[PDB]
Amino acid sequence: LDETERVTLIVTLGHADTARIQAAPGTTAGQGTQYFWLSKDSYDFFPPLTIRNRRGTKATYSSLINMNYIDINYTDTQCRVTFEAENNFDFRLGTGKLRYTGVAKSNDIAAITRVGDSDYELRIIKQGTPEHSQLDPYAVSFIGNRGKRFGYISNEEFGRIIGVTF
């Protein structure tokens, strides 16, 4: 991992991003697969999307990564990031371990730090926190029609803002 690529993806979370995280067990709201929807341009932040869809007629190009859910102390070696190429151009980051946990809601900030070629750490930056205030401006790029914002920050400065050594 080149020094230039040791960065953190900051993205403002929406409703669909946290619908299953906030939902109660057995609710329709808490049904389905839990993702964070990212920008399609962020694929260069991830390993080569080479893993193909087994079933299905439409093409999906996926990659498996080690995601370190920091807020729940869990490293999922099977965190799938998928580009729905022939469907709706969704770029999804699997976050199923946060289901029914309620650690994130709308306008919270997801911080995805790249610490290796295939190694990542996921932190939820709750709204109302100084960290959220200092991280929010780094999300300059507007995506979606619901006002999602994303951007990148050096692991250094992010580490300073949240008080963590990388």
Partner DNA sequence: AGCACTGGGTCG
Partner DNA sequence: CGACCCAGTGCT
Q: Which residues bind DNA (CB under 7 A)?
A: 14-17, 19, 28-29, 31-34, 37-41, 53-58, 60, 62, 78, 80, 82, 84, 87-91, 94, 96-97, 99, 143-146, 148
Closer residue to DNA, CB minimum distance, 22 or 155: 22
Closer residue to DNA, CB minimum distance, 140 or 164: 140
Parallel, antiparallel, or unpaired: how do β-strands 141-143 and 35-38 relate?
A: unpaired
SS3 of 2-24: CHHHCEEEEEECCHHHHHHHHCC
Rounded Cα distance, 56 and 23, in Å: 28
Cβ atoms of 49 and 38 closer than 8 Å: no
Rounded Cα distance, 53 and 29, in Å: 26
Closer residue to DNA, CB minimum distance, 62 or 113: 62
Question: Minimal distance in Å, beta carbon 48 to DNA?
Answer: 16
Question: Minimal distance in Å, beta carbon 90 to DNA?
Answer: 5
Closer residue to DNA, CB minimum distance, 38 or 153: 38
